[PDB]
């Protein structure tokens, strides 16, 4: 139907139809008679999986030729998707199967509803992994995701009663047909045990054996024959586990929890002995991987070349443990004196940080890691006192310095700094956007930064437009192929031609155009899979993103009551209609969360029927927010809420998402967000609110959130509704601890940027009455949203810390 | 190579090889430079699979067309084995593939050794059901086997410093090609709960939910293009288990454990609950999936009919749930009056006894039921009043009989006696042998038969010559073939042929030589995989079968002494060498036949290093004894040891495959021993021992075990050895409970046949030093071994119970 979508030839989709009756026959054993829709996904999935292994086989075969470096990127989640579009959109399939199932009598768009999603992150740290690998593939590299198998990913959310619960992800009940089962290279993994001192060094010795059982998945990069390999872990006991009888099998259960399911915490570190278990199980098992292809290699025993042949790129210092546990192979089993070991770990391994919110930071009790990792233990105490001495050297007599610096923390319990112990054991430290990597040197690495400048770096992240453009927006990335051409796909930088066509009238209806299909298409999803009915005329105002109080889903609440309140007041006068909709997952433990998602609920209850209202304004939580839901509503949104306060999100990729697909933004100059506004041009934004200098000048003069109360006559009436229960009739002291938490210990200052907010939502209706002007406004952020392509993100890590050189050089087909 | 293995086309091969190819790449993800024999023997298994789904798509649809009488055969246990080559067997492809694989350069028997076993079972039982499947669908019965799927079957035996060390079986590690998941037919099972009682009868409320997941495996007939279906339940927790968040996902397990492991006991009951949950597992998921395929039929909401198109076969009590939960849905839920229920329930189930030993029998304590499964306890309370209420009109005044027919068992823990649920709920109640059948009837369902005569049948029990001779002898399935055609495959009394033969020369030296060939492959193979050396000229004396007492694996032991310590009196004296090989599964709990098998290997210590023994008598204990194992050493024995206590063996099947190969057999006139020596006629068997009657009349004196140790100075000698240490000189007590047993408390009656025992094995020894009067008897017993084909014992479970008519006849390919 639409170019960018490939050619659907004669030769191929005869071939496609073909490869499909067989695959629903041979490989599914159904008939057409007995076949449902999932039947013929699955039918689907598989013939457009044949494409790949091919190019898969090649592709390895072609690293284990040339012996490239190898990147080795590390991370506890990867936020996968859905598989089979984006597989069709990089192989130049989807137009042909579009057409071989057109002539078989199927609707392919019905079929792709059926995949589950890989849902195996939280958020942004997950989908940034996902894109980072699409983007590796892309531009050529020898790239490697490791991560867990988890059998149960993020859970999946019902709203009951306008609460959150939580139910179990089973994304592996029907299979997966993307994976494959590698049991023949299962790896042993060690815990508990005991440190054991002989004339040959330490042994750890008395171990409990837990197996690791790969399982890989194909990455196709885009058009370039590429496919690379994400393995993940997947935890097995050994057959003599234990060995009444019966007792004894069932028991492998407890070895078998490691994999089972993922831990649930968005930016929040839980201090949990199977959480340490898993990021260790990661590690151990990925680093004998390493080894093993390292040293079955064309080119070389001489771990002199580790890193000439090797990268490590640490996501967050959940697999920090890789540190050690390199030093641990190094020094107890391949025999390397220290210095020259911890030489090559440091030219190894590279950090990558990910927030300087407190409780996010990872610091474990010593007393777990002596128990379960003896010798791990001993190694970060010798790499603490070697880098303190050095500390020493550097500053002397400056002891407080060696306090705040130590990777041991004394107190009541004595607990492991993580992110201390990256920094000391990577080349490479980098934050997420410019701003956030300049609060790490300037504040919570400032000492580390001190000692060593030239390892702290920014890599300002990055979304893939192959997911985020092409697959969920087509009707947009048509529209501009047909001015610019496809190239912009892989060099989105292109899309600044866009900005020639900004006084373009014909450009200028067919944005406008897009916008409202996907529009109309979304309030169309909503009544089907959610009975609920929305104007598709009105502005679509969407917050979505992990339930978080420094995110600031209550400054919006605020606003959405404010605007209910003046209708109220002035019945009679007209406002620009709203649909605000805010989704998001709050963590099971997170009390503060799940009273804001029912607030938000509330505040629709009251909003959504009342008959003064009308359509003007509507409040509705997007249930179950998950990448699948994010490529439908994406494409559908008019403004961008990124309102979190300043100095809080290190980048947002949301906001990024957002952009290219033709939303303006209201937001704090925060994250990525000032480098977006940047790109654009500060007129193109709505920016508003405290700047990072401006919430530290509160701080020091102490946040008093009563000031705002007394005097802002409109914030006092919202928090007066809140207390006395009018959107909790029956309940009426139902939100007494939002209004306590707002009052009294607000950490985000919520109320010192309501004015600003209101004000400046104010300017985004003003613009909304002029469509042709504030179309404009949206070509001049898609055309300048090019930096925010993680192929560009990537060819900074590949080019700043990996020491490799990108390709957009084919492979043979 | 040989004619048995059908036709090897040039068409054929061609497509075989390219489909290898094919399944190599695109199924495996493997070229020819990184696969190993493993790859290699999934890939040849997906290219054979693929030639059973079409026949297996159109078998199920000619059933829904037709709809003819469908048969449920329920089973706890399928001890299956290994499928590759059965599979190639019975699609006439054994030829095609060993030719296209040699082209290929691979060898075909190397590839089927890599196959693991389905050990579902646990021996004589479970076996059974395995044959029954295979000869079901060779008789073109619309027939379903249905049972567990358990993730780890029988465990794999270890023997360690001469003691069994038990290891997990697990058979599903690298993946099962032959099973289907059907993740969408997934059905609910409930536990635990209450009833409640309204005015529409009674509600099981507040119960826990089990999902089972339903695996399918083709069940091929011999050459006829029949495809049944093997249908195994797999445990399942629902989404909302349990729904910290963590610990809830993880307790899942708890809900999964009921499908994760095979109970180890042969012949014994365990009255655990996890048992208890397994059997009802597999009835209400089943029932549930029978009555689906009832209303969804071509037939007719009318139950009278349910009779006339379904028949259910209880494999032993294990599934004895199925009768009261046949009247609970009825009753409870399609609204069925009570006594229309219980017709209908009595004609659709037959049940099958399998022992009389008093420890084998189910007697579930009610408070298990009570609380587990609350209505059926109420359905059973129900069954036994109405049934008792038939009893008393019957035989009025016989209050001692109404306390022995009971279901319920009273006593310090009241109990549900299953055997008494099952005959009363089945209008056909078989034995598995006709002397076993006559033991039923005259003592311990004595009061049942004289109720309801007409109840009571045998059916002896078979074997398939499919496996149990084509696949495991083809040597000797040619040589028949040779003289008398290939028809006797799917006719074995066509056997009979062979009368005329046994007195030609020809076929003598034949028979011989495809024995001695046998016997040195099995040679080599102990070589191979177990550094063990034997004469292949000596007689292969081997008791293969699970340990247990009333198997009396000590009774060989003694004879084996016995030779050993005749030749230590006479070295120098000829004796005819043997081989004695004794090989089973202890259960884990078994302490005596644990204390058996160190026994055996002691002896083996002792007699195998002797030098003045030489290599006239060696003692191997055969590892891990399971089906594929059987496969190879059946096929090389010369001597098959049948030696229970007459009246304890309800039939054996054992015993039927070995005089199918070519042995001859030692034995006591037990089980089905009786029927083959009655068809080979007695001067071709080496029957020795008590009758029935002499144990009988032995226990009304009363068994004094000292007599006979007084009496015969050969056995004192070895009960003096035993004691002293002689077997065991660092422990010199190591056997006292075997003698203790031996001498106080053998329920066996091990030393009573030990005279008859001694000089019916000197006739053995007599006969074997003349090769062709050896093999002329041989000749005999293979010849009229016909009656023993698992064909005849379910062409008579067809007319005689099911009311099915078999069929020959081809469906179309
Ligand atoms: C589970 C969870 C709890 N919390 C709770 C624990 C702390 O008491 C509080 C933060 O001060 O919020 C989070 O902030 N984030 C989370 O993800
Ligand atoms: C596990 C097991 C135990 N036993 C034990 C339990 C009893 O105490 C004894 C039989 O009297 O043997 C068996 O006979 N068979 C078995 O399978």
């Known amino acids: 139907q639409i170019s960018v979508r490939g050619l659907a030839g004669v030769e191929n989709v005869t071939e496609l139809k073909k490869n499909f009756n067989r695959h629903l026959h041979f490989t599914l054993v159904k008939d057409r ?99 980072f690998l699409d983007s590796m593939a892309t531009l050529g590299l020898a790239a490697y995701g490791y991560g867990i198998r988890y059998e149960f990913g993020i859970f999946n959310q019902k709203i009951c009663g306008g609460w959150q619960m939580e139910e179990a992800d089973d994304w592996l009940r029907y299979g997966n047909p993307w994976e494959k089962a590698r049991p023949e290279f299962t790896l042993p993994v060690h815990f508990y045990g005991r440190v054991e001192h002989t004339s040959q060094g330490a042994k750890w010795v008395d171990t409990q054996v837990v197996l690791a059982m790969p399982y890989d998945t194909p990455v196709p990069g885009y058009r370039n024959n590429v496919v690379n390999t994400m393995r993940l872990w997947s935890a097995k006991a050994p057959n003599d586990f234990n060995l009444g009888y019966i007792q004894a099998v069932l028991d492998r259960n407890l070895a078998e929890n490691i994999s089972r399911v993922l831990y649930p915490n968005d930016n929040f570190f839980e201090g949990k002995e199977l959480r340490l278990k898993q990021e260790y199980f990661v590690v151990a098992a990925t680093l004998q991987d390493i080894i093993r292809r390292f040293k079955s290699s064309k080119f070389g025993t001489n771990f002199d070349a580790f890193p000439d042949k090797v990268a490590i790129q640490l996501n967050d210092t959940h697999p920090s443990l890789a540190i050690p546990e390199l030093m641990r192979v190094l020094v107890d089993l391949e025999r390397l004196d220290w210095d020259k070991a911890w030489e090559v770990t440091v030219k190894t391994c590279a950090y990558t940080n990910h927030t300087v919110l407190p409780e996010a930071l990872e610091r474990w009790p010593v007393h777990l890691l002596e128990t379960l990792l003896p010798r791990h233990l001993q190694i970060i105490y010798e790499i603490n006192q070697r880098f303190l001495n050095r500390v020493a050297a550097a ?108 006084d373009d009238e014909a450009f200028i209806r067919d944005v406008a155009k897009v916008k409202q299909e996907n529009k109309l298409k979304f309030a169309a999803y909503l009544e089907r899979e959610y009975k609920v009915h929305i104007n598709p005329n009105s502005l679509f105002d969407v917050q979505v ?259 490799v050189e990108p390709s957009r050089q084919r492979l043979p087909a």
């Open 545 to 803: 993103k992990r339930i978080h109080e420094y995110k600031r889903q209550l400054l919006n609440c605020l606003h959405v009551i404010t605007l209910y309140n003046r209708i109220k007041k002035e019945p009679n006068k007209f406002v620009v209609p709203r649909t605000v909709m805010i989704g998001g997952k709050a963590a099971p433990g997170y009390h503060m969360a799940k009273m804001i998602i029912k607030l938000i609920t509330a505040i629709g209850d009251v909003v959504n029927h009342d008959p003064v209202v009308g359509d003007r304004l509507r409040v509705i939580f997007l249930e179950n927010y998950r990448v699948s839901l994010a490529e439908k509503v994406i494409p559908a949104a008019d403004l961008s809420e990124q309102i979190s306060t300043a100095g809080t999100e290190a980048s947002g990729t949301g906001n990024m998402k957002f952009m290219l697909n033709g939303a303006l933004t209201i937001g704090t100059m925060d994250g990525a967000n000032v480098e977006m506004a940047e790109e654009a041009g500060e007129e193109n934004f709505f920016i508003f609110g405290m700047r990072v200098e401006d919430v530290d000048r509160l701080d020091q003069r102490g946040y008093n959130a009563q000031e705002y109360y007394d005097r802002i006559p409109e914030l006092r009436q919202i928090i007066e509704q809140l207390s006395s229960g009018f959107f909790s009739p029956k309940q009426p002291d139902l939100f007494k601890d939002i209004v306590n938490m707002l009052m009294h210990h607000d950490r985000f200052k919520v109320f010192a940027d309501y004015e600003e907010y209101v004000k400046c939502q104010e300017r985004v209706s003003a613009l909304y009455k002029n469509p042709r002007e504030w179309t404009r406004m949206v070509i001049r952020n898609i055309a300048t949203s090019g930096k925010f392509s993680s192929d560009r993100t990537i060819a900074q890590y590949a080019r700043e810390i990996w020491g």
């Open 395 to 502: 500053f002397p007599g400056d002891v407080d310095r060696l306090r705040r610096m130590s990777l041991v923390e004394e107190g009541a319990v004595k607990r492991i700094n993580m992110a201390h112990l990256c920094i000391a054991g990577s080349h490479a430290v980098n934050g997420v956007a410019r701003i956030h990597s300049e609060i790490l040197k300037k504040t919570i690495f400032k000492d580390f930064y001190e000692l060593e400048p030239h390892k702290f770096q920014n890599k300002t992240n990055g979304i893939t437009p192959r997911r985020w453009l092409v697959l969920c927006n087509p009707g947009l990335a048509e529209i501009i192929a047909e001015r610019i051409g496809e190239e912009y796909i892989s060099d989105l930088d292109q899309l600044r031609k866009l900005l020639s066509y900004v």
């Open 33 to 131: 008679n007995v076949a449902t829709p999932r039947d013929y996904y699955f039918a689907l999935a598989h013939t457009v999986r044949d494409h790949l292994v091919g190019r898969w086989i090649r592709t390895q075969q072609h690293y284990y030729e040339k012996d490239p470096k190898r990147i080795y990127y590390l991370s506890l989640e990867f936020y996968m998707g859905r598989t089979l579009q984006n597989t069709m959109v990089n192989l130049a399939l989807e137009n042909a199967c579009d057409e071989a199932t057109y002539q078989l009598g199927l609707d392919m768009e019905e079929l792709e509803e059926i995949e589950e999603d890989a849902g195996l992150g939280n958020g942004g740290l997950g989908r940034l992994a996902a894109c």
